[PDB]
Symmetry: C2
Subunit: 183 residues, 2 copies
């Protein structure tokens, strides 16, 4: 109620600490020293380092997604809204890969309804023909955040151009959109 305002202020600061310093190497002692708080002050809001990460991620993605909705120009068609939202954006140790995975999952879950809305708008305009708008939104986001992640798959830098092309091709098929939609 009031506890929520304080917890998210800290989560925001923890985000900056995890990004700037890495998740694996950030200790609860480093966090509290950097924040200027005690162990007790931290344990009042979080039970673990994982919860600190989840709170940092939730608040960052909740913010980023809300700033996409407020920045959305009134009356834009679905094709332009899709193009605009696709261009949006905020060591590879096992724990650092978990922080990245958590972030991909949160982005997918927060952006899926926005993309679902765009897809539904396009079905109504007659530019797409998608049977399952929310599932298709989640499908697209999974491809953009897992398949196009070169660090996840250790994809070669010279192969990324073909993956983006293949991604656009897939988007066209899935949406039943015109072939020149993403040109």
């Amino acid at each position: 109620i009031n506890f929520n305002n304080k917890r998210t202020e800290l989560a925001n600061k923890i985000w900056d600490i995890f990004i700037a310093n890495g998740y694996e190497n950030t200790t609860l002692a480093f966090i509290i020293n950097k924040l200027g708080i005690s162990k007790g002050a931290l344990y009042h809001y979080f039970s673990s380092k994982e919860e600190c990460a989840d709170a940092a991620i939730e608040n960052r993605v909740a913010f980023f997604s809300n700033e996409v909705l407020k920045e959305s120009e009134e009356g834009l068609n679905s094709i332009e809204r899709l193009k605009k939202i696709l261009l949006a954006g905020i060591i590879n140790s096992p724990s650092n890969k978990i922080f990245h995975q958590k972030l991909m999952v949160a982005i997918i879950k927060y952006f899926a309804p926005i993309y679902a809305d765009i897809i539904s708008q396009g079905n109504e305009e007659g530019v797409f023909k998608v049977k399952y708008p929310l599932e298709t939104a989640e499908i697209i986001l999974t491809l953009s955040h897992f398949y196009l992640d070169e660090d996840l798959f250790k994809w070669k830098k010279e192969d990324m151009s073909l993956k983006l092309t293949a991604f656009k091709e897939t988007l066209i098929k899935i949406l039943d959109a015109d072939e020149d939609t993403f040109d």
Copy 2:
């Protein structure tokens, strides 16, 4: 050369230890005690617990994928090969989620050429019309191993039926296959 035969025999045994006991809670001391080997015997083949996991995963997936190729019936059409291969199959703490992620990534990388071959066969038969066979194979596997993973996304059990339906719909669009292909 000869070192490889021994290393993969251990990797196979480590796999069983990680599955039966969980990755997070499996200590290097538990591994060596269960295997009947010394710390030195283990450090001769692996530098870390992560490398033990990667070796266990590589050898399991390399095996599983090779047993799919040997079990493949001679002269099956692409539609039946696809249906057959789709039915194939071997705590949620941060480290356990890494073991699972590593496994998903290895399955995708080992099975992609098999699915690419099936897709190419179908393009030749005239049952599919896919511009990028290997990228499309990787796209499909990403959806079956990330999007359909209810533990990754914490999807509701009652929503899984719609996700499978949406997955099949997507497969049909991506492959340019007939609508009754997966019935």
